[model samples]
Target: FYGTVSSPDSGVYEMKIGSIIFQVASGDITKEEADVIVNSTSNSFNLKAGVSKAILECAGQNVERECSQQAQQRKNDYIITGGGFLRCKNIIHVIGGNDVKSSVSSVLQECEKKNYSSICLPAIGTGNAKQHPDKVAEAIIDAIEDFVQKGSAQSVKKVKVVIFLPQVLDVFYANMKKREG
Candidate 1:
């Protein structure tokens, strides 16, 4: 979902899934400049903890308000909101449910419809959802694989996952490496 390498030394791992470039990076998600920054939040859009809370705080009050305003329009799974002060143009707030795979597919479908070339993803369900890092990475990568293999990812060129915690970063990076071959 994003590009512009923060730094050469940053632990950014990448590979090609079909024609699309996939990356796993250890950094702050708010700093990414992707066309759409995907967030895993609660069904109620509660900004209390994890990356969802941080994105709300960084993007300022307008994003928070927009999220509430758009709640009724959510398609049973996720909501789309303006990025407000963030660098990205749009934000896709996904309901952090048990079906991480479905959420990933839905986001990709949205990207195709919007003609967005890139997107940024967090390790869904890994935070307040209390999911294992390994499981999170597998589900996320598997969705990307399915989307690209099915040729449904026409507009998507780059897909990136930004992980904040060091332990989770290691697990995500390792799992991503396995997807390369």
Candidate 2:
């Protein structure tokens, strides 16, 4: 279910390190079909709207219920739970905030620790949180890059980021091109 998936309006940056691979894409993350789908949750673990609500809708309300029952964490930290009806085995509920990059990095590190592989991450702060997708994509890739450079990249073998809109998709690539330098 993993390969280089991209288009003219979309692009992917992928790298194979040891046994792990990193990727980012522009599309609906909920349908990405990964072993894990990270939910850009709120500080209180709310599932009201945007990415959180979409997951609950597609995966099942059980996912939100399961997360609501779990212990919450602060910035950059997360709690993992069953993916409900989603294809993924676990969902990394990252509490989104001003520090989305750190939160994402922490999840990747935790993924290594938990020995889970393959994840699809949605653009963390573009919805109701009102953040520039440029920063969102850049920061996310930064987290993924940090995890890779830390020598724990092999712990999770696959990584993907799903973008929902074309303008956001444009920002993502614009950010990607900047990172190339």
Candidate 3:
């Protein structure tokens, strides 16, 4: 199920999952080692409590307002911010760790629970967390699929994976396609 690799940069790859494009960076791991990690990580499945409700319920705290008006500018250690034309909604940005599977799952679940109709994500943990691209992709796909299956409180409709690099995109797309076909 391997697809064509697009970029030759060390530790950088791009691929597509569903309608989203994702980028995976080896971070601190050697490329070969990263590949092994990615493959192994991709083969497993883990499930936990969903996060969609928490996010929306937390809206009572005005998290979205805070994220849009102030949280985006906080410049925290792991969080990053960007703007998009997503039905005029503000994007909630958070940083994630490599191999920190539980944290990644929690964050995504929170987003799903928040009932975000369309959200874009990068390959978490792959960059600074030294996670392999494939592994990161697998975790992300699992979270999204889980969210879709659960059906959020407000009905989250779409998720967008954004990968800057093309090689990563190819890998993600190939894997996602395999799941679909």
* Candidate maximizing lDDT: 1
- How many clashing pairs per prediction, in order? 5, 1, 20
Q: After TM-score superposition, what is the CA distance of residue 69 in candidate 1 from its true location, in Å?
A: 2.1
**Residue 106 miss distance in model 2 (angstroms):** 1.2
Instruction: Looking at model 1, report the run of 10 residues with the lowest lDDT sum.
Output: 1-10
Kindly give the stretch of ten consecutive residues in candidate 2 with the minimal lDDT sum.
1-10
Q: What is the C-alpha RMSD of each candidate to the true structure, in Å?
A: 3.6, 4.2, 13.0
lDDT of 3 by residue, 1-181 (tens): 1233344455444443333333444222111110001111111111111221222232233433343444345444322122222222333334344344454445455545654444444554544345676776677766655544454324344344445456666666566655653
lDDT per residue for candidate 2 within 150-176, as digits (tens), equals: 776765877767777767767765655
Give Cα distance to truth, residue 147, candidate 3, Å: 2.3
- What lDDT score belongs to each candidate, Candidate 1 first? 0.81, 0.71, 0.40
Residue 14, model 1: Cα distance from true site in angstroms:
0.3
User: In candidate 2, which residue pairs get closer than 3 Å at backbone N, Cα or C atoms, i.e. clash?
Assistant: 76-103
The residue-level lDDT of candidate 1 at 174 comes to 72
TM-score of each: 0.90, 0.81, 0.47
Q: Name the TM-score of candidate 3.
A: 0.47
Q: After superposition, how far is residue 8 of candidate 1 from its true place, in Å?
A: 6.5
